[PDB]
Design an enzyme around this catalytic site. Structure first.
Site, PDB file in Angstrom:
ATOM      1  N   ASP A   1      20.773  28.387  61.869  1.00 38.60           N
ATOM      2  CA  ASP A   1      21.089  29.995  62.185  1.00 38.60           C
ATOM      3  C   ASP A   1      19.381  30.619  61.894  1.00 38.60           C
ATOM      4  O   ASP A   1      19.320  30.940  60.719  1.00 38.60           O
ATOM      5  CB  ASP A   1      21.750  30.610  61.506  1.00 38.60           C
ATOM      6  CG  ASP A   1      22.030  32.745  61.806  1.00 38.60           C
ATOM      7  OD1 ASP A   1      21.561  32.955  62.228  1.00 38.60           O
ATOM      8  OD2 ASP A   1      22.611  33.251  61.107  1.00 38.60           O
TER       9      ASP A   1
ATOM     10  N   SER B   1       6.964  40.675  70.736  1.00 42.24           N
ATOM     11  CA  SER B   1       6.585  40.231  72.038  1.00 42.24           C
ATOM     12  C   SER B   1       5.476  41.199  73.158  1.00 42.24           C
ATOM     13  O   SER B   1       5.223  42.419  72.853  1.00 42.24           O
ATOM     14  CB  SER B   1       7.784  40.008  73.201  1.00 42.24           C
ATOM     15  OG  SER B   1       7.290  40.208  74.915  1.00 42.24           O
TER      16      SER B   1
END
Ligand SMILES: N=C(N)N/N=C1\N=C(N)c2ccccc21
Ligand SMILES: N=C(N)N/N=C1\N=C(N)c2ccccc21
EC number: 3.4.23.22
Length: 330
Positions: free
Chosen positions: A35, A199
């Site tokens: 994770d 992004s």
């Protein structure tokens, strides 16, 4: 040193991935959920409330000659999905894919919430976010990666998740045969303890690319891709009959649909998520409504590039002095 381990989807939808981890001496192998959105290595154990264990493999520190109680230390974690677990702490030898860390904090669960009990395939979590998020008190502990870093040939790990298939976590090296083209690296902020990046935009299907900054985290422990409501609406508007369902808790779409791809930007480069990766199957068994793999992050407070996005790429978690993320097509 290096390590390399295969990670395997827990079910036919890729709802999560499990990776075998050796703990203790002799080794006890548990299948953990790696994770990159959390920083605790915790396991079902001989101390977990018996009624909360249902099929998991447990760690028994009393059977490990290298286990040592970390005296006084406790841990307690709550995940964004509302699940939780807590307990006490041992140190022990932990190996992943041939890479060994001695003295790793292994957090033994005394209590886990119902969603953990109900997942018989997941024996615990191995956190790979920054150690500043580790919950052990009063002495915060380091992640497996943080402990291994100095011994590794290079201070990196990579995630190469499969679509409806196994993939690979590597530690300490880049497998240049595992991707196509070049790796585009992008800056990371560690201020919230995550692999947080920006992004450069998105496209839906064959549509034109929209240049826009989308801050989010690279999180292997989250199944889906959570993005701003504007972006998510633009995606689902291209699927006839798709809608946000308050009763189901997100976007659903007709199981008869063929989904468009979704592209996200990494610098000037582009990662294309095929439409099929966005199909999470019937909302309930046999239903003609299917669950979408792209969902709104509104209310979560952060955008999450979870497995739907990451499995479309070869992803480098670069833990050099200035950490960065790398993405390549594959
Ligand atoms: N993250 C986890 N530790 N487990 N996540 C899941 N476990 C499931 N059964 C499931 C179904 C749909 C989506 C996610 C999960
Ligand atoms: N709330 C529901 N009735 N169904 N929720 C799901 N149904 C899926 N297939 C799925 C996959 C990933 C996450 C959630 C779901």
């Amino acid at each position: 040193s290096t390590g390399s381990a295969t990670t395997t989807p827990i079910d036919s939808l890729d709802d999560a991935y499990i990776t075998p981890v050796q703990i203790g001496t002799p080794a006890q192998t548990l299948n953990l959920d790696f994770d990159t959105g959390s920083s605790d290595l915790w396991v079902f154990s001989s101390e977990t409330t018996a009624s909360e264990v249902d099929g998991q493999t447990i760690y028994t520190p009393s059977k490990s000659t290298t286990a040592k109680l970390l005296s006084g230390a406790t841990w307690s974690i709550s995940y964004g999905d509302g699940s939780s677990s807590s307990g006490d702490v041992y140190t022990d030898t932990v190996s992943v894919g041939g890479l060994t860390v001695t003295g790793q904090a292994v957090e033994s669960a005394k209590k886990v919430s119902s969603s953990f009990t109900e997942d018989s395939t997941i024996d615990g979590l191995l956190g790979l976010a920054f150690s500043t998020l580790n919950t052990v008190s009063p002495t915060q502990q380091k992640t497996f990666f943080d402990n291994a870093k100095a011994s590794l040939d290079s201070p990196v790990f990579t995630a190469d998740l499969g679509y409806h298939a196994p993939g690979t976590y590597n530690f300490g090296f880049i497998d240049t045969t595992a991707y196509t083209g070049s790796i585009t690296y992008t800056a990371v902020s560690t201020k919230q303890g995550f692999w947080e990046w920006t992004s450069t935009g998105y496209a839906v299907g064959s549509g034109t690319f929209k240049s826009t900054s989308i801050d989010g985290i690279a999180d292997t422990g989250t199944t889906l891709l959570y993005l701003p409501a504007t972006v998510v609406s633009a995606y689902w508007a291209q699927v006839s009959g798709a809608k946000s369902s308050s009763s189901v808790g997100g976007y659903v779409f007709p199981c008869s649909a063929t989904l468009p791809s979704f592209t996200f930007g990494v610098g000037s480069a582009r990662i294309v998520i095929p439409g099929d990766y966005i199909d999470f199957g019937p909302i309930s068994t046999g239903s003609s409504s299917c669950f979408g793999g792209i969902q709104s992050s509104a209310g979560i407070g952060i955008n999450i590039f979870g497995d739907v996005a990451l499995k479309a790429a070869f992803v480098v978690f670069n833990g050099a002095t200035t950490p960065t993320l790398g993405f390549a097509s594959k």
